[PDB]
Write a protein that binds this ligand. Structure first.
Ligand SMILES: OCCOCCOCCOCCOCCOCCOCCS
Ligand SMILES: OCCOCCOCCOCCOCCOCCOCCS
Ligand SMILES: OCCOCCOCCOCCOCCOCCOCCS
Ligand SMILES: [Mn+2]
Ligand SMILES: [Mn+2]
Ligand SMILES: [Mn+2]
Ligand SMILES: [Mn+2]
Ligand SMILES: [Mn+2]
Ligand SMILES: [Mn+2]
Ligand SMILES: [Mn+2]
Ligand SMILES: [Mn+2]
Lengths: 389, 375, 389, 389
């Protein structure tokens, strides 16, 4: 059945490319992807699948039932874009001012639509079901994966597989790693309340800028002391709002930060240590601290059994692309929510452009090699056919 | 021959109060004091004095020449009001909403006007000339005293004498102190330029919030290590503008600061030391620092001979303090001439919304200044 | 009467100088002044005074009782020397080890002995009692004043007067200031207990050098923020004992500091603020702190009423030297212990060498004009006869 | 062989254990391994190999020449012990008080000796040469690999293979990882020179304790800001020698620190950032800084091709034991010197006790499963035979 799969996919490469470009041209923001969601549901018209709409708001769950009893494998593609002004480059650059598919979600949707169509004409080659998940709202908390889980997107599902194109990794192969593969994320706001007063009488006041500044310096020990050197953690203060008047001792500063930890234990340690510094600042400087600490996407955990199965299957099929281990990746990803409800594997397709500058994700000049489309379909399809045989 | 003085004053007290209430009712901002400069000029109409209406921007210099040679004493009273919304509940409260005479400059003006008219009447009783300085724009930099000095005001003057009403000194005498008595001021703006980037890749960025935070931390050593314990210095960062985005390492912060020193040497040391740190931050964190350092009011030096001189002269007629926190642009006169600045008790909160004072200050002020003038 | 006193003291000026030079030739360290205390006691043999000698260690109190009811004035002179090798090269330079009268205590004792001798001959000319306090151990904490006081040196005393010769002030006047004139002192030891460990697993340790280092950084705010700009305070850490093995996270550090305040209120603010930072360190870094905070010399408070009276009394006596107000002085002085227990005045006699370069107190080249002896004796005697009229 | 090798090795397991236990009983410190070196030389007597004994001090190089054309492969076992008092309660525990084979270097030497004897018997079964490297001094810098390399140990050598038993990885598998597997090391001494002075006149001095403390504080940013979250690095200050007189402003402080980096670029970035802070302290505080920065063991780099090869070879043979990927490891390892010169693999054999408590390397209670001996020899031999086929 694999042989047939590959040539059908190769013969539809042009269609994937044409679809990516249309979607690239009409990107929509997270929680406002009205046209994209409608386009995806319309694609499946005339095709032999069940499409369930509005799973999350704009959640789309297309079921490909072979008609025969068996496992259920979910395959996931996200479709939201970002608030970025496109600077490509390209004839099919976004005509929706200020928004751009800067993370390859258009490409994820493109290959998945064509793969799903293809798997639908091959019900005679597998058992059980494929659940194709077209997910909105990946980019902005609370995200789409969460809302889709709450609406039962994973009812019946044994395993989840997802693919992300990587504009930073070499085209011509797919990449994998069991265990923790992408960082989880938290956000915090800290209000540091001292006491304002005239700038010539500091003894009468309690300087919030000094306290907040000492806090920023002490905070560096969370990463530098409190985490193991073999852990992966980040604590960034992106906003120190202490704007005031020249000669008035500042009464309050607002600090906002974000946190990444590659494992849940690392996230837990960071939260504990930032809370210790924040509470202790009150005793050290006599300020009042108001900490709001909001957990956000968990770290993405690639189930070791399933992920190794995926890499084993792909190496044993002998396709026109290589398969190899990779390092963990910096950004957070809401696929991590699937990966925490079911054993899952999130894998990567090399998408670095052949010629010209290589830009990272979310950059205005972001671009991928379009032959990542076919490789993604071939890879995911191969897994689907072996799994569910 | 100073009971005449004394008695003539005691008599005209109630005149001082009216005037004070009238000015308190119609207050005007620094550099916007058109009607008060007019009123002060008109008050002297009919009186044997010479009045300059623009020395300079709205500076009022009234000279009282005895017609005889030839020593020259300048006495100073300021007259600008403050941008605050009066909340005293007074029968003569500000009619100019948002503006208030909340430092007592209306009182300075009131008593001085009345002492000046009195001194015009005793031209026989003294030699040389008196220069009455009615000064606008004390409150808002650059002043104030500054322009006036360049524009004529000090020409031929050998000593300057001034008085402030202190709403927080009981109110039964006039307080003083020789030597450096009020701090001078400077301010600065520091741009700390690093390199912005996505929050998950700190190694590709240079965090300006971290550099700036470390700067504020090191800055504490200026007062705590670089100055003598016996010096008086203040280095305050009142503005740390590092407002940004969750999720983005901040590329630039803007720091604004406010410096005080009790001596001009202390101010220079603070400046050197802030510059050392600013420059050092660049080497230490790899940032670019753009420091704008603005000098402001000098420290107020009460000439020690002349100050005891006036205290002795006052003591020997008939019915010391700590240095004071505010900066005072009188310091500019005191930089160019041997001068003395003394205080008059007025306890009924300076620059406070509910600012009030004892009205016995007015009369005490005229008594002490007049006495000194005749010597 | 005054004319008597001045004349009498003038005729004895040679005796003052001879005693001073003798004492300068044989100086003794604080708490080791046996030979000097015996000389002081021996001086009073043959003289009509009451000499108490055990109050306290090497402390000598001599009472000159008019035999009539009245007030009691204490007058104080110290006699300890300093651990300094004299390189002044004077004929009468120290021939005792490596110790020198580098603070002019030989001059205080010398004029005081002769003044006391003179006052005993004038019991007719005053009422009540003079108490002469010959005090050891001024230079080294805890000091002699505190010890003499707990041994009843101020029993029944109404006021205390003291004089210090000043090598940096112009000879020819006496100097005074009401209120706080000299700084008080405190000292502290802070033990910072963390958790030691192998240098490459910071996450398993609690780094005491890091906590201690943050402490010292934060401590700068005591003087830079918590004190009024017009207060006079210093907080110095002279010892940060964090010596260990380069590759071991340090378990404990010992920090030692020294504090000065010109007012007792300044000293109290400093103590309160250092205690706040020590306990805030525990809460921020999870270390355990033991702060040992030892108050030492109070700041020297010159009673305004008494000091003004002294100044006035000297001005209105027809004396051959001026009297003028001075600035407060940097060094600490254990006379402050008396000034704390009784309304008191500490005044200065100008002693700067009229020719040649002037050296400060506690210097190897330290030298004083010997005219300061007579001036001191006349000044103190004038106050005595007037106060006890 | 290749089934001949395994059978021969299996029949010699008893011998492996006896050598291990003997060596365990008589451990010797780095640079002092006279008797262990002798023993190793004594083992090859009467065995058909070419023994060189003075390749650096205590360096033993054994060449097993097949006589035939082929490649050359060096295999490495280290033989130094540690300054640790044994507490295992084993019958063959160290009889050299205060010294213990607490890293399993006795086991490395044992399995290697038996393997090399076996490989000598099979010169007909391979082509090229085997260079067996018996290396002293691994534990104490500057260790043994460098001197041996300087003395021509890697001459003609194409690849280097080394094995470490791992007391905290499960018996019985062999573990591997391409790329950087073990951290490199550096150390530094910083002298921070200000200007000493009386503790209450800080404006006249330049406080080295203050500057030193601000330096430790700023140093935290090296790891917390200058390193990628995905890099592995440590900066520890183990020594802050600022002991002084509590009331003197300290003239000089000595700081000593320890650095780890998993890659050589990480180590280089750490050196750069510490030098930037050091040089920058001079500018900010006006102190003089003398930094001695000494690079020690480089990070251990496993050549990707050779280790993938080593892993493939092991898996395809049919050994009694499994083969799987490990994480990189905290400790330093002077094997890294060979790995920089020739394409190398350093792999691990699981040696955790199967019963009772698991203790790490350099622990007084360190203990290993003795099954790791046979497994190690079987692994290294299999690579030798397939590589030299
Ligand atoms: O003079 C400083 C200019 O800053 C522009 C930044 O571009 C220079 C190279 O920086 C690119 C990647 O950032 C590296 C992180 O900076 C770490 C230390 O920054 C030192 C400033 S050269
Ligand atoms: O606990 C305060 C902050 O420390 C955070 C760093 O934690 C490092 C690991 O902490 C372990 C906690 O144990 C506390 C001390 O235990 C001492 C006894 O342990 C001895 C065996 S290691
Ligand atoms: O500002 C950039 C250059 O600074 C000018 C010289 O600075 C030298 C470094 O000393 C800074 C520390 O100042 C401490 C005060 O010391 C005062 C006495 O020093 C005498 C010469 S070291
Ligand atoms: Mn994205
Ligand atoms: Mn994405
Ligand atoms: Mn004002
Ligand atoms: Mn004013
Ligand atoms: Mn002394
Ligand atoms: Mn003394
Ligand atoms: Mn070891
Ligand atoms: Mn080892």
């Amino acid at each position: 059945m694999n042989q047939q799969l590959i040539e059908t996919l190769k013969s539809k490469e042009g269609k994937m490319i044409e679809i990516r470009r249309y979607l690239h041209q009409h990107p929509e923001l997270s929680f406002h992807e009205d046209e994209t969601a409608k386009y995806i549901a319309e694609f499946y018209k005339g095709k032999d699948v069940e499409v369930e709409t509005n799973v999350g708001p704009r959640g789309i769950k297309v079921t490909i039932d072979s008609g025969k009893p068996g496992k259920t494998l979910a395959i996931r593609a996200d479709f939201d874009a970002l608030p970025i002004t496109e600077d490509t480059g390209l004839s099919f650059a976004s005509q929706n001012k200020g928004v751009m598919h800067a993370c390859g979600h258009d490409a994820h949707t493109a290959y998945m639509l064509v793969l799903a169509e293809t798997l639908a004409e091959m019900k005679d080659s597998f058992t059980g079901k494929v659940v194709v998940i077209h997910q909105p709202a990946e980019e902005v908390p609370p995200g789409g994966a969460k809302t889709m889980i709450e609406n039962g997107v994973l009812d019946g599902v044994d395993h989840v597989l997802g693919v992300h194109v990587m504009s930073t990794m070499k085209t011509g192969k797919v990449y994998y790693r069991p265990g923790y593969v992408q960082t989880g994320r938290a956000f915090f706001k800290l209000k540091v309340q001292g006491k304002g007063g005239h700038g010539s009488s500091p003894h009468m006041a309690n300087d919030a800028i000094v306290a907040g500044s000492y806090f920023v310096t002490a905070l560096q020990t969370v990463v530098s002391r409190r985490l193991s050197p073999f852990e992966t953690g980040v604590v960034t203060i992106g906003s120190f709002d202490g704007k005031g008047q020249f000669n008035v001792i500042k009464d309050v500063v607002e600090i906002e930060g974000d946190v990444r930890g590659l494992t849940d234990a690392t996230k837990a340690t960071i939260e504990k240590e930032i809370k210790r510094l924040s509470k202790g600042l009150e005793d050290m400087y006599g300020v009042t601290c108001t900490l709001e600490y909001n957990d956000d996407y968990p770290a993405l955990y690639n189930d070791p059994e399933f992920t190794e199965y995926v890499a084993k299957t792909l190496k044993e099929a002998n396709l026109d692309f290589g398969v190899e281990m990779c390092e963990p990746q910096p950004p957070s990803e809401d696929f991590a929510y699937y990966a925490k409800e079911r054993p899952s594997a999130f894998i990567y397709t090399g998408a670095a452009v052949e010629n010209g500058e290589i830009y990272p994700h979310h950059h205005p000049k972001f671009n991928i090699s379009e032959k990542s489309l076919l490789i993604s379909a071939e890879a995911v399809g191969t897994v689907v056919l072996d799994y569910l045989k």
